[PDB]
């Protein structure tokens, strides 16, 4: 609210914004938020299980809030002498206890990589911490509820779960993904993006398990379901920071020349209960033989004592970055390819934005079992290339040995074409079932396919070699279908598949 016409000046720190226009790659994201409201001034959460469409990160923030503050950051400062000179080191370790809520960070990566409008489904709001070593948990039943809700929406094409890797067990994780694949099979218009449970060996509570075999045994559905999704490995390191407050951070201070107790006494000595405190404290001077002046204080309480320490520590805290599963980055990448090259091209050999590096290095030889395997349950790799950065390498589905459906771009092209055609055919639903209708429907479908051919989506020198459409009594329908009100239309398409291998050969030129 401003009252005087004119120009106002503010000073802030942030990353610049990014938006995009996307028609064919709209994801839904199911998970936890800070709050969920329809108006800025309400007495409750209005949107907990209500899908909402968001155009940009600002719209998200407006109704759902930001990230949860981390409560696992500690600081250790040590004072020593070098040939009689003072020298100190400030060390801020990576936290071992982190907030389990990743939707905010996930969306930042999505928009950074070119994503457009999307659907948000809340499952609840962020819970609190029990202690500095005891974080909130993720409730499996809340994610199932959100999935049941999105099932009633028509617009979404991709399904993602930003907080699935934080579920208490791997069994719950795999169960959630099996349900998502089954939903895609029943609706015939969706595709899922999958992560491993962890990018490192995980502890089952009874055994040490390797993440790739884990996922392969975890997802046990057949061909009909596997054709509707794909998986990526490893996790990636981003350039995003952590959200925190100096009020929650405590400093340990060690010194070659201790003075924590003496400091407390000088201040305490500066009524009956005050005397008891001082005596109790002075008794400890013989005990403390390691701690310096700042030991035990919070960052926000030492700035006036030494703002060089305060500022140095904040700078060190800022050097720690966020690590994420790659699924939201891939949803972003899918949108970029559809806009620049088309849905019929493979979503691979794509650079990712805001990625420093893969968390795990994958060698050439190590990928052979990821691309080709006896089970067909292929995994695509994220790899670092010299002079190029982090690229998506490979584009197969979870049915990698399927002669018709092994490539992602074939499955996605068909889903697109099928959706567009049925929208076009709905205008004829209550028309008479006769020759006049059969001709109108056929002509409409062929015109659509001619345009797809003209744009280079279909194979063939002329439309006659790219597709066919058939309808008629004695061809696709019988007398019984006419009596029951059925209409049968048959369509066939010629679709182009990519090359994967290039072999070079060298020799010594001779006559």
Partner 1 sequence: SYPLSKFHFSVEWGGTKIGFTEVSGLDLETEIIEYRHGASPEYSKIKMPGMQKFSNITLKRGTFKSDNEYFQWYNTINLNKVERRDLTISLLNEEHEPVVTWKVKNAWPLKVQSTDLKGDGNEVAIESMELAHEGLVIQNE
Residues that bind partner 1 (CB under 8 A): 340-341, 434-436, 439-440, 443-444, 446-447, 450, 453-454, 456, 461
- 439 binding partner (options partner 1, a copy of itself, none; Cβ < 5 to 8 Å by kind): partner 1
- 446 binding partner (options partner 1, a copy of itself, none; Cβ < 5 to 8 Å by kind): partner 1
Q: Using the 8-state DSSP alphabet, how is residue 291 labeled?
A: B
Bond preceding residue 234 cis, omega within 30 of 0: yes
Whole-number Å distance between alpha carbons of 68 and 22: 30
Task: State which of positions 361-390 bind a copy of itself (CB under 8 A).
Answer: 364-365, 367-369, 371-372, 374-376
- Binding-site member from 257, 490, 494, 497 for a copy of itself (CB under 8 A): 490
Q: Tell me the closest approach of the beta carbon of residue 93 to a copy of itself, in angstroms.
A: 9
Query: If binding is defined by CB under 8 A, does position 482 make contact with a copy of itself?
Result: no
**Residue 194 parent element (H or E):** strand 191-194
Neighbour count for residue 342 (Cβ, 10 Å): 16
- 413 binding partner (options a copy of itself, partner 1, none; Cβ < 5 to 8 Å by kind): none
Whole-number Å distance between alpha carbons of 441 and 77: 77
Whole-number Å distance between alpha carbons of 450 and 417: 12
Task: State which of positions 423-462 bind a copy of itself (CB under 8 A).
Answer: 425-426, 429-430
Q: Tell me the closest approach of the beta carbon of residue 281 to a copy of itself, in angstroms.
A: 24
Query: If binding is defined by CB under 8 A, does position 403 make contact with a copy of itself?
Result: yes
Q: Tell me the closest approach of the beta carbon of residue 238 to a copy of itself, in angstroms.
A: 19
How far from chain centre, in Å, is Cα 294?
40
Q: Which is nearer to partner 1, 414 or 428 (CB)?
A: 428
Backbone φ/ψ region at 505: left (φ over 0), alpha (ψ -120 to 50), beta: beta
Q: Which is nearer to partner 1, 130 or 447 (CB)?
A: 447
Question: For the range 194-198, what are the long-range contacts, defined as Cβ-Cβ under 8 Å and sequence gap of 24 or more?
Answer: 194/219, 194/229, 194/230, 194/231, 194/232, 194/327, 194/398, 195/164, 195/165, 195/231, 195/232, 195/233, 195/235, 195/325, 195/326, 195/327, 196/231, 196/233, 196/234, 197/165, 197/170, 197/173, 198/165
- 153 binding partner (options a copy of itself, partner 1, none; Cβ < 5 to 8 Å by kind): none
Whole-number Å distance between alpha carbons of 275 and 233: 63
Whole-number Å distance between alpha carbons of 123 and 50: 9
- 19 binding partner (options a copy of itself, partner 1, none; Cβ < 5 to 8 Å by kind): a copy of itself
- 304 binding partner (options a copy of itself, partner 1, none; Cβ < 5 to 8 Å by kind): a copy of itself
Q: Which is nearer to a copy of itself, 213 or 389 (CB)?
A: 389
Contact code string over 164-183 relative to a copy of itself, x by CB under 8 A: --------------------
Helices 140-150 and 170-187: angle between axes, nearest 10 degrees: 10
Torsion sign over Cα 353, 357, 360, 366: positive
Residues 100, 135: contact at Cβ < 8 Å? yes
Q: Which is nearer to a copy of itself, 10 or 83 (CB)?
A: 10
Residues 294, 253: contact at Cβ < 8 Å? yes
Q: Tell me the closest approach of the beta carbon of residue 64 to a copy of itself, in angstroms.
A: 14
Q: Tell me the closest approach of the beta carbon of residue 191 to a copy of itself, in angstroms.
A: 26
**Which residues lie closer than 8 Å to 23 by C-beta, 6 or more apart?**
116, 338
Q: Tell me the closest approach of the beta carbon of residue 456 to partner 1, in angstroms.
A: 8
Q: Which is nearer to a copy of itself, 131 or 464 (CB)?
A: 464
Task: State which of positions 262-321 bind a copy of itself (CB under 8 A).
Answer: 304-308, 310-311, 315
- 340 binding partner (options a copy of itself, partner 1, none; Cβ < 5 to 8 Å by kind): partner 1
- Binding-site member from 282, 323, 401, 437 for a copy of itself (CB under 8 A): 401
Q: Which is nearer to partner 1, 320 or 442 (CB)?
A: 442
- 134 binding partner (options partner 1, a copy of itself, none; Cβ < 5 to 8 Å by kind): none
Structure tokens at 281: 């404290």
Distances (CA, A) of 147 to 31, 86, 276, 334: 10, 60, 61, 22
Structure tokens at 471: 């309808």
Distances (CA, A) of 95 to 22, 254, 255, 294, 363: 38, 20, 24, 21, 29
Q: Tell me the closest approach of the beta carbon of residue 407 to a copy of itself, in angstroms.
A: 12
**Which residues lie closer than 8 Å to 307 by C-beta, 6 or more apart?**
none
Query: If binding is defined by CB under 8 A, does position 152 make contact with a copy of itself?
Result: no
Query: If binding is defined by CB under 8 A, does position 153 make contact with a copy of itself?
Result: no
Query: If binding is defined by CB under 8 A, does position 18 make contact with a copy of itself?
Result: yes
Query: If binding is defined by CB under 8 A, does position 7 make contact with a copy of itself?
Result: yes
- 17 binding partner (options partner 1, a copy of itself, none; Cβ < 5 to 8 Å by kind): a copy of itself
Q: Tell me the closest approach of the beta carbon of residue 303 to partner 1, in angstroms.
A: 38
């Amino acid at each position: 609210t401003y009252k005087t016409p004119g120009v106002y000046i503010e000073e802030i720190t942030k990353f610049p914004p990014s938006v995009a226009q996307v028609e064919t790659a709209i994801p839904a994201f199911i998970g936890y938020t800070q709050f969920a409201r329809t108006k800025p001034s309400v007495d409750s959460d209005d949107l907990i299980l209500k899908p909402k469409r968001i155009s940009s990160l600002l719209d998200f923030t407006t109704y759902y809030g930001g990230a949860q503050n981390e409560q696992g950051i500690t600081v250790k400062l040590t004072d020593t002498l070098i040939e009689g000179a003072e020298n100190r080191t400030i060390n801020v370790p990576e936290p071992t206890f982190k907030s389990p809520y990743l939707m905010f960070y996930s969306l930042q990566m999505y928009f950074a990589n070119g994503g457009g409008p999307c659907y948000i489904v809340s499952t609840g709001v962020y819970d609190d911490w029990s202690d500095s070593e005891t974080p909130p948990t993720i409730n499996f039943s809340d994610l199932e509820s959100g999935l049941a809700v999105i099932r009633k929406e028509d617009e979404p094409t991709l399904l993602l779960f930003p907080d699935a890797t934080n579920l208490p067990t791997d069994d719950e994780f795999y169960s959630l993904y099996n349900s998502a694949l089954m939903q895609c099979n029943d609706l015939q218009d969706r595709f899922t993006i999958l992560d491993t449970y962890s990018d490192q060996t995980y502890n089952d509570g009874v055994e040490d398990l390797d993440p790739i075999p884990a996922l392969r045994n975890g997802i046990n559905l057949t061909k009909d379901y596997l054709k509707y999704g794909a998986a990526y490995y490893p996790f990636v390191q981003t350039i995003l920071n952590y959200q925190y407050s100096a009020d929650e951070i405590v400093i340990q201070h060690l010194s070659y020349n201790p003075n924590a107790i003496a400091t407390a006494l000088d201040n305490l000595n500066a009524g009956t209960r005050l005397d008891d405190i001082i005596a109790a404290v002075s008794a400890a001077e013989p005990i403390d033989v390691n701690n310096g002046k700042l030991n035990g204080r919070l960052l926000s309480d030492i700035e006036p004592l030494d703002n060089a320490t305060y500022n140095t520590i904040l700078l060190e805290i800022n050097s720690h970055k966020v690590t994420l599963p790659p699924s939201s980055s891939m949803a972003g990448a899918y949108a970029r390819v559809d806009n620049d090259r088309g849905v019929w091209k493979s979503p691979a050999n794509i650079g990712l934005n805001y990625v420093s590096k893969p968390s795990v290095t994958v060698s050439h030889e190590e990928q052979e079992s990821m691309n080709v395997h006896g089970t067909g349950k292929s995994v695509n790799a994220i790899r670092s290339f010299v002079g190029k950065g982090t690229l998506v390498w490979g584009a197969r589905t979870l049915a990698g040995n399927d002669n018709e459906w092994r490539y992602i771009s074939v499955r996605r092209f068909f889903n697109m074409a099928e959706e567009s055609i049925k929208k076009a055919t709905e205008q004829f639903v209550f028309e008479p079932n006769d020759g006049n209708t059969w001709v109108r429907v056929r002509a409409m479908i062929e015109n659509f396919l001619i345009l797809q051919w003209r744009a280079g989506a279909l194979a063939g020198a002329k439309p006659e070699h790219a597709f066919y459409v058939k309808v008629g009594l004695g061809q696709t329908m019988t007398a019984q279908d006419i009596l029951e009100g059925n209409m049968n239309v048959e369509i066939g398409l010629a679709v182009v598949r990519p090359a994967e291998f290039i072999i070079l050969k060298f020799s010594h030129k001779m006559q």
